[PDB]
Structure formats: C-alpha cells, structure tokens
Amino acid sequence: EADCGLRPLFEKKSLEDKTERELLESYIDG
Amino acid sequence: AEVAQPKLYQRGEGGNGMEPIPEDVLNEALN
Amino acid sequence: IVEGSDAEIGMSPWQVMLFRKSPQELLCGASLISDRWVLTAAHCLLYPPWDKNFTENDLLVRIGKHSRTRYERNIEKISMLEKIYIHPRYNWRENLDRDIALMKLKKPVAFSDYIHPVCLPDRETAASLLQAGYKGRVTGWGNLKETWTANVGKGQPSVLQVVNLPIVERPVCKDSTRIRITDNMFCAGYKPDEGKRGDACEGDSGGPFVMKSPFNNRWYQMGIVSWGEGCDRDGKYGFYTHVFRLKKWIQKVIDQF
Ligand SMILES: *[C@@H]1O[C@H](CO)[C@@H](O)[C@H](O)[C@H]1NC(C)=O
Ligand code: NA
C-alpha cells in the first residue's frame, strides 16, 4: 500500500513525535 | 548447544489485570 | 520494554496485540502490514519446548490499542483470523532461526488515526537503514524489568511502551552469546560503555523493530522481537528476526493466499 508508514497523527499532519529526532540524529552521528 | 529463549511469557502474565472484551464486540467480529 | 516510555497517542498505529480468546490473555505483539495481514513471531503460535500451539480459532488481534488492559471503546478494533502461516524452516530447537509468522484477518480492518499499516523494506532500504549505529524503535506491552530488584517500578506497564535502540555490529552480536547466530537475525541495544540502556523483554516478542527512512519520511519494519538472554543485561543484546532477509517468503504467502 502506497500509504504505508505515514502516521495519520504525525507525518500526515507534519508533526514529529517526542523521540523520533533521536532516530534521525543517529543517521548523522551513529 | 544452548537454546535461544523467546521473549514470551511462560507463567500466565498475559492475563494480569486483563479486562474482558464485551460480548457484543466479540460477536460482531465472529459474524 | 525496559528503559522505555509511554507511547504517544497514535505513535505506533501498526502495533497489534495478539490476544488469546479463552482465557483472555495478551499473547504477543504483532504488526499490521496491510488491511488484512499481520506479522508476528513464529514462537507466538508454535513453541513445542513449552507445549505452545495456537491455531486460527484460538486467537484474535486487537488493533489501535494503547492501554494494556482496558477494552478501548470506539478506538481499538478486533478481528478474527482466517489463516496462520509459520515459516516452514522455523528452528525452535536451537536458535529461533526464521522466527516469523503471518496471519490473514477474516475481515479487512478500516484504517483510522490509530490504525495504519507499516511498510516492509525492499533491498536498497534494508541495505541503507540496517547498519550498525543507526537506531530503530521497539514497542510492546511486555515486562519493564527482567527482575524485580532491578528497579522500583511495576512489572508490567499500563500503556504501550516505546524505546529507541541502536543496531549492533554483527561480530559484536556473535561474540555476545554462545547461541549460534544466523543471517536471518540481527541484534540491537547499547554496549556498557555507551551508558544508555534499554531492551525488549518478556511479553514484547512478536512486536516490530521499526526505522524511519531519512529519505522518504516513511516507517519500515526491519525486525521482529524474537529472543534474548535476560533483558537489559550488560554485554547482551536483544535479537530480532531480520524481516527483509525473509521478505521473499512473506511475498510468496501474501501473493498466493
Ligand atoms: C496444533 O493444534 C491443532 C489443533 O489444536 C492440531 O490440528 C495441530 O496438529 C497441532 N500442531 C502440532 C504441531 O501439534
Ligand atoms: Na544489554
């Protein structure tokens, strides 16, 4: 399904959850 | 050879404090 | 989940609770990958060493849940199972190799703010994301500690728990255990000198290890909580079924049934 992995209450609203920045930061520093 | 142990309850902990699913909800799914 | 925190509402809308009908019990975590297919661990359905064998009529899935214990009116949806598919070369005897199973729902679930499927990785996504040092996310309703004296909190959470954990180099995973590791699993967690802690624990198995693609904003299920030696032990790691390494079987089952 082309809509998988995009959360209605977050990505679809351009909102980030409280800890996902730690995942994205690991791509930079990990 | 050692045996890998799954991260699965073995002593019934899955039932702890578990509230029953209402019968109207259970019967709706069964039909 | 050890050293996690309460999930936010809708934070993991693909999280599924595999539920035993009678007696009413949490069985395992699982994940929604489409409107009618759910991914979990094989040992949730078939584990002969503990005389475990569940078929389709024994279980149901609860989707959109947050509370571990409450029936969440007008939020969660429950579905019966039509068919269970366990990997034909699942190795419960030794190292839980290919610890994966698929469940087809009797009726498709309607998506909502709290119910939405996760993506499965392709070859370049797996090559790109599944690298040591990159962190993924594990969610579950399982134990908060291996033992009681390990901290002052409760044994089980009232609400779905979340923790982020780094993928570990394969030679470090292998040296951490005397169990024979295969290419169909990976391990995640912190080393002692990294200071931070966290792990999946008893009751979390079957749930998803997910990563967010830095290139298209989507969440991909890379792993399934499988096994470990204790929980959050120094020098040990949680082990996960490597989802992409088994995607050919996943696709075979879904395309055929
Ligand atoms: C599991 O149980 C079902 C029915 O409960 C039975 O038909 C099946 O043969 C069992 N599987 C094994 C491996 O014993
Ligand atoms: Na550890």
Domain with residues C15-117+247-256, CATH architecture: Beta Barrel (2.40)
The residues that bridge with C31 in the sheet, in sequence order, are: C15, C39
Preceding residues of all breaks in chain C (C to N beyond 2.5 angstroms)?
Answer: none
- Which DSSP category does C167 fall into? B
Neighbours of C170 (CB within 10 A): 14
Encoding tokens for residue C102?
């698929």
Contact between C11 and A17 under an 8 Å Cβ cutoff? The reply is yes
Q: Relative to the alpha carbon of C173, which ligand is closest?
A: 2
Give the three-class secondary structure for B6.
Answer: strand
Task: Indicate the helix (H) or strand (E) that contains C62.
Answer: strand C59-63
DSSP string, C104-149: EESSPPPP-SS--PPBPP-HHHHHHH--TT-EEEEEESS-S-SSGG
Under 8 Å CB-to-CB from C104, ≥6 apart: which residues? C36, C37, C81, C82, C83, C85, C257
Which amino acid is present at C193?
D
d(CA C166, CA C177): 18
Pairing relationship of beta strands C135-140 and C208-212 according to DSSP bridges? antiparallel
- Listed by number, the residues of chain A in 1-30 with a beta carbon closer than 8 Å to a beta carbon of chain C are 1, 3-11, 17-20, 22-24, 26-27, 30
The experimental method is X-ray
Give the span between the Cα atoms of C107 and C121, in whole angstroms.
25
d(CA C184, CA C245): 6
Counting ligand 1 atoms within 8 A of each CB, the residue from C55, C86, C92 with the most, and so the one to mutate, is C55
What would you report as the CA-atom Rg of chain B, rounded to the nearest whole angstrom? 16
Q: Which atom of ligand 1 is nearest to C58's Cα?
A: 5
What burial class does residue C28 get, using C-beta atoms within 10 Å of its C-beta: 0-12 exposed, 13-18 middle, 19+ buried? Answer: buried
Q: Where are the alpha helices (DSSP H) in chain B?
A: 23-29
Contact B12 C228 (CB under 8 A): no
User: For residues C227 and C216, what is the distance between their CA atoms, to the nearest angstrom?
Assistant: 30
Q: Sign (positive/negative) of CA torsion C48, C170, C180, C247? A: positive
| Residue of C227, C237, C239, C241 to mutate, testing the B interface (most B Cβ within 10 Å of its Cβ) | C227
d(CA C34, CA C111): 10
Protein residues within 5 Å, CB atom, of ion ligand 2: C 189, 236
Nearest CA to ligand 1 atom 13: C53
Q: How many domains does chain A have?
A: 1
The parent domain of residue A26 ranges over 1-30
Domain containing residue A3: CATH number: 4.10.140.10
CA distance A13 to A24: 18
Given C199, C205, C226, C232, which residue is catalytic? C205
Provide the residue type at C234 as one letter. D
| C87 labelled catalytic | no
**Residue C133 C-beta-side C-alpha neighbours within 13 Å:** 7
